[PDB]
């Protein structure tokens, strides 16, 4: 037995962009999941197929902690059955998701005066992601009938766009750090 390295995930200094969402694969370790839920740091703590307090009493093999940054009004999309740019083109949960979605405001860390543009999301994609699919390609998106030939222009858009995180953004446009815990149930 040994405690899960959840500190490395939740307390990581830098977070991935949502299109290149980071995944941490952890063996069947032990963790006081009840203490996580009762942490005031977490403003979003939503579990599906299982209760936060009964997480330790689960039969699974690997737990995955996926984590990334999105904007506040996009946290609603990190849930089974959702549509929109994030759920369709960046990070998709399955309908039968078993696990938890944890999120918190990171304006004090991921916003910069004059804008922090390091965080990106996929704005254009021909089709929806399958659940737990990751797409990091950067091919020019062809929105018209003429081929782009790797040159941006009219009807030829780079498929990723930067968030513009400023401290004075409204809360729907402030950065949120998200961790998704899923369980390979037996």
């Amino acid at each position, epitope marked *: 037995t040994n405690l899960c390295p959840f500190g490395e995930v939740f307390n990581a200094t830098r977070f991935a962009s949502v299109y290149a969402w980071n995944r941490k694969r952890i063996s069947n370790c032990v963790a006081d999941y009840s203490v996580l839920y009762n942490s005031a740091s977490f403003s979003t703590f939503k579990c599906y197929g299982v209760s936060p307090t009964k997480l330790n009493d689960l039969c699974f093999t690997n737990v995955y902690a996926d984590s990334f940054v999105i904007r506040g009004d996009e946290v609603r999309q990190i849930a089974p059955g959702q*549509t929109g740019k994030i759920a369709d083109y960046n990070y998709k949960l399955p309908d039968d998701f078993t696990g938890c979605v944890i999120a918190w405001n990171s304006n004090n860390l991921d916003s910069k005066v004059g804008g922090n543009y390091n965080y990106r999301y996929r704005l254009f*994609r021909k089709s929806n992601l399958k659940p737990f699919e990751r797409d990091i390609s950067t091919e020019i*998106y062809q929105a*018209g*009938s003429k081929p782009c030939n790797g040159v941006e222009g009219f009807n030829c858009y780079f498929p990723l*766009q930067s968030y*513009g995180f400023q401290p004075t*953004n*409204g809360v*729907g446009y402030q950065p949120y750090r998200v961790v998704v815990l899923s369980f390979e149930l037996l």
Partner: antibody, heavy 118, light 108 residues
Framework: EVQLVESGGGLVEPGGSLRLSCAAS????????MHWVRQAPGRGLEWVSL???????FFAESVKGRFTISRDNSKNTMYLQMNSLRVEDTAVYYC????????????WGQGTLVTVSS | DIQMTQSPSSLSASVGDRVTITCQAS??????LNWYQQKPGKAPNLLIS???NLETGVPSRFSGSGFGTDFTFTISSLQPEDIATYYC?????????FGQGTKVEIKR
């Protein structure tokens, strides 16, 4: 040339149904954020619906459950299927292409008139 | 929904005057406000996007500014071909909503 062209609007009785088309050139309908926007006679613009390239659809509350969106990629055409039409659905209907965040609704068709009346 | 309050609902200015149109959002919409021109019987034309982008081919006498909840649309020098109804539109909050419009006539 880059163009959107709506057709299919006409006189329909209340409670009837009707299908509009939005035929594009230059723009690939199925690769774009495509909207329907309507304008009642003498009134302002009112958003109706949106379909993502990936297929996700969104609808205004006034038309939710009555309108649906179809796409025929081989005709480069988007369809708005309108059911259980009401008098207050009477308007000119436009389709429009949006390039979100980095631009606006940059192409609109000429519009097609739907008249719901007995 | 987000309500866009567009003022004035109509104005009358002479050729070459400066025209200012305001649009105020009920909630924060960051920079995602667009401006359109519509002549009677015609489809709207995109003039400004993202609060201040001068869109392709649009004459430089049109401009926009603002961020958050208060936005402004300017015609620096009103021209006879500018007789139209102008609309703001917030684009990035579902459902996308429009201002009530501003009918611009010309004083002569």
């Amino acid at each position: 040339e880059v163009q959107l062209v709506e057709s299919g609007g006409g006189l329909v009785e209340p409670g009837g149904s009707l299908r509009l088309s939005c035929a594009a050139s230059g723009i690939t309908v199925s690769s774009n954020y495509m909207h329907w926007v309507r304008q009642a006679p003498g009134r302002g613009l009112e958003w109706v619906s949106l379909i993502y390239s990936g297929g996700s659809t969104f609808f205004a509350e006034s038309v939710k459950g009555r309108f649906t969106i179809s796409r025929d990629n081989s005709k480069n055409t988007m369809y708005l299927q309108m059911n259980s039409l009401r008098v207050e659905d009477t308007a000119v209907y436009y389709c429009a292409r949006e390039v979100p965040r980095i631009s606006g609704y940059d192409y609109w068709g000429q519009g097609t008139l739907v008249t719901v009346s007995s | 929904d987000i309500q866009m309050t567009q003022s004035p609902s109509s104005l009358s200015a002479s050729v070459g005057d400066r025209v200012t149109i305001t649009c105020q959002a009920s909630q924060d919409i960051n920079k995602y406000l667009n401006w359109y021109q519509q002549k009677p019987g015609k489809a709207p034309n995109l003039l400004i996007s993202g609060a201040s982008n001068l869109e392709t081919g649009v004459p430089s006498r049109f401009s926009g500014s603002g961020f958050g909840t208060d936005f402004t649309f300017t015609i620096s020098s009103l021209q006879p071909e500018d007789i139209a109804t102008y609309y703001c539109q917030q684009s990035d909050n579902l459902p996308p909503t429009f201002g009530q419009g501003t009918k611009v006539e010309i004083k002569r």
